[PDB]
Amino acid sequence: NEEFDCHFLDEGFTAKDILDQKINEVSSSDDKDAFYVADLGDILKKHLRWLKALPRVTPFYAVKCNDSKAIVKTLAATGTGFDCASKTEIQLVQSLGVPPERIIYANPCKQVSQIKYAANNGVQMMTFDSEVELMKVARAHPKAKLVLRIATDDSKAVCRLSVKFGATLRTSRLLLERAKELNIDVVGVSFHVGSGCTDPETFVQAISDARCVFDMGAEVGFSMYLLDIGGGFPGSEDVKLKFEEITGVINPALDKYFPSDSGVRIIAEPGRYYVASAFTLAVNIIAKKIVLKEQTFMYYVNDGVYGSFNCILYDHAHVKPLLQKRPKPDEKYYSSSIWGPTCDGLDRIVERCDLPEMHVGDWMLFENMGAYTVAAASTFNGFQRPTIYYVMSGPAWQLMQQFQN
Amino acid sequence: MNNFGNEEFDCHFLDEGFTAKDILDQKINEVSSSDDKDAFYVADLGDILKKHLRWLKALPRVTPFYAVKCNDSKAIVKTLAATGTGFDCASKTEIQLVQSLGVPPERIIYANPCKQVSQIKYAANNGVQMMTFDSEVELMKVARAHPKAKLVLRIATDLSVKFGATLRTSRLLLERAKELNIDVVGVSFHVGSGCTDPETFVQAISDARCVFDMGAEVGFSMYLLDIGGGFPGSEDVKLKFEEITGVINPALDKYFPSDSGVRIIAEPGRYYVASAFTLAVNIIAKKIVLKESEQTFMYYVNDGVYGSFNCILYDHAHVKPLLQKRPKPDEKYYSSSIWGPTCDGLDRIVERCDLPEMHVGDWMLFENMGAYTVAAASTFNGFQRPTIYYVMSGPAWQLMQQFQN
Ligand SMILES: Cc1ncc(COP(=O)(O)O)c(CNOC[C@@H]2CCNC2)c1O
Ligand SMILES: Cc1ncc(COP(=O)(O)O)c(CNOC[C@@H]2CCNC2)c1O
């Protein structure tokens, strides 16, 4: 099918050039639906970069970030783990041939029937942060390996008084004693610093806290070996806090609190890092209005906040439109807004930006659209999700085969 | 109650003396001793038939065209088509859905002011003649891909930011349409969903009259007046349907008398379906928080802001959780929050409310969940859309048959 359909990327060509080619090919066809170009070679590059930056940390891809079957198949061929939050994601991962020991059910609040499904399919490792979860596990998957998820405080997060997941150290101690009472095996500690991390020092704090809980486990009789540092790493270079800074702050903390001789196994749950920059979205300007204030423009394109751009609300992502052909400096720029296809007035992509005068049929490009865009899109107003074209060069395929070897 | 075959076309009998609430009670009791407690809807089509009867009684001069985007369930569209209402379609997929159920094109209005060219072409190919517009570029596109269309000018009202032409712009649009030999047959407006002041309608109607007169000056024979939607779909509102209709009908008689030959239609979306759907979610997780001991609770249920409750973010909807059994007056209440199945922290249905202490396996009910809830739901994190159980009483079926004749 199209999902499993992969196109060759010839030598000297990038995803950008492929985008330009397809756009030129449909110049006078009049079928100008929005579409993605997904470079799996970018995912292989990200994996190489991860192996180089965090050699002690095994990556478990957060499927909920992008559940595309091609992505999961490529990552499974690469040999990464997978973080699954629901029965459907476990089904997806196992359907591609991944054994259960490469799957972590890292949802702290799981429905009982889904816990039973995880037990039925041999997924042993699950996270938890509450006593009711311990009761449910004892009653539905008693031989599970539990990872205690501890809380982290993020200043940039809107809500800090109420945190959905994560136990405090005080609560963690009681959770460990309760797990010992119920004869449930606790094997490690997990945390999630959050995508909007501004200061890498936070990770260190979390790591320190994790060590503390590890010691607590040693006091209660548990053999703790699994440390899960979660996700939140950036997926593109268009950020102030870059991946390598975070890793350079993390590695000394890991060496200090969890030395290799201790026998600890360190993992992570990066979602956006692997896929963010792999996808580039092309939308077509389907409508245009001119408002006199000085000329300003309202452009309507064929994707919106109910589709790929739901990240504007759910993830609060900031999107900047890109022109296919670069404009000369002398050309005048105008104040413009960009709107979605749906009738709702709340379907606005960009409130105000500077753009040259464009016309219906012109294309706009959005880079770094791999993370939390298609995974949360809906078909409101009947508009279908854009076709995704997967590309991969021969050298990239060779690297993937080497990983299999 | 269990669906057999296809859920979309499966309808269950509602016995005499039974309401949707009783069906909810029965379904909840049926799964009392099992762990498959997925969230589900009960949809009373008889409530939709009641809404249609109420509309016919309140707005005898206004033909309703159901806004398919509010709820695209095939059962809903089938019932309304059997009832003989029109349909407002915003995209190619909605036209496909409506025509697949046997609705002729003259009962379809393409009320999307900014349509992609290929979708205009599709509408032309399938005989849908009537389309809305509010811009000159739209006139160019129509003259190119649908020359014999009947255009309805959408005017601004005090959604207005995204759509709606001013009277000044309306004059130029009518003259430009005359230049391009495009037939303009009427005027449409949308006062907005959940309008606080009914007087707006009067103003809008007045404005419509003006544009009608403009058409008479340029040579158009204007006959179609479209007053849009925005009518409430439940009694749980300050401004009730009958007040709005009591304000609308005199304005229609004053500005568009029946002897003038005008044909008046509307595009009610939420009015027909809002109260017809009741949602049942199961409490899948529970946390107890101590305030320094004042006990507060966090309940995690199996639907969230990525699912049915996306209306909180998109539709500005306030949800009221309801208990299956009415609580005792002396029963103690606690401060509580309600959270979704997904790992995302922002997936919170209710920040704070007063509820008695509940336990995993208990059910919560949400009424008036028919409008803009399932139509914009996604499968983020792999969580599946709730099963919908359609019910209909015998007398409701008799009323539907009377409408069909
Ligand atoms: C438990 C857990 N592990 C990993 C991730 C992935 O985070 P990343 O930033 O690496 O993609 C998550 C996801 N956390 O938040 C996802 C939010 C949903 C919309 N965008 C942010 C979790 O929870
Ligand atoms: C053009 C048009 N006609 C009808 C409707 C339906 O409005 P109603 O309030 O009767 O359901 C609409 C609605 N448009 O957007 C609805 C937004 C989506 C989420 N809540 C607001 C339009 O546009």
Residue numbers in the entry:
A (entry chain A): 6 to 298, 311 to 422
B (entry chain B): 1 to 158, 166 to 299, 310 to 422
The authors write:
Ornithine decarboxylase (ODC) is a pyridoxal phosphate (PLP)-dependent enzyme that catalyzes the conversion of ornithine to putrescine, a rate-limiting first step for the tightly regulated biosynthesis of polyamines (putrescine, spermidine, spermine).1−3 At the molecular level, positively charged polyamines interact with negatively charged RNA, DNA, and phospholipids, thereby directly contributing to chromatin biology. The ODC enzyme is a homodimer, with the dimer interface forming its catalytic site from residues from both monomers. We report two X-ray structures of ODC complexed with new ODC inhibitors, computational docking, molecular dynamics, and binding free energy calculations to validate the experimental models. The X-ray structures reveal that covalent adducts with pyridoxal phosphate (PLP) are formed in the active site of the human ODC enzyme, as verified by their preparation and enzymatic testing.
We then turned our attention to the inclusion of the 5-membered pyrrolidine analogs. Compounds 10, 10-R and 10-S had ODC IC50 values of 0.36, 0.21, and 0.10 μM, respectively. As before, it is anticipated that the PLP adducts are formed in the active site and are the true inhibitors. To help verify, we have also prepared 10-R-PLP and 10-S-PLP and found that they both demonstrate inhibition of ODC enzymatic activity, with IC50 values of 0.16 and 0.03 μM, respectively. The activity still favors, as observed for 10-R and -S, the S-enantiomer with 8-fold relative activity. In each case, as we saw with APA, the adducts 10-R-PLP (2.9 Å resolution) and 10-S-PLP (2.0 Å resolution) were formed, forming trans-oximes with PLP. The lipophilic cyclic pyrrolidines of 10-R-PLP and -S-PLP, form strong lipophilic interactions with Tyr389 and weaker lipophilic interactions with Phe397, the pyrrolidine rings orientated in an orthogonal manner relative to each other. The basic pyrrolidine amine of each makes a H-bonding interaction with Asp331. Although the structure associated with 10-R-PLP is of lower resolution and does not include water molecules in the structure, a well-defined H-bond network of direct interactions is available, which explains the similarity of activities observed. While there are some small differences between each structure, both networks appear to be equally strong.
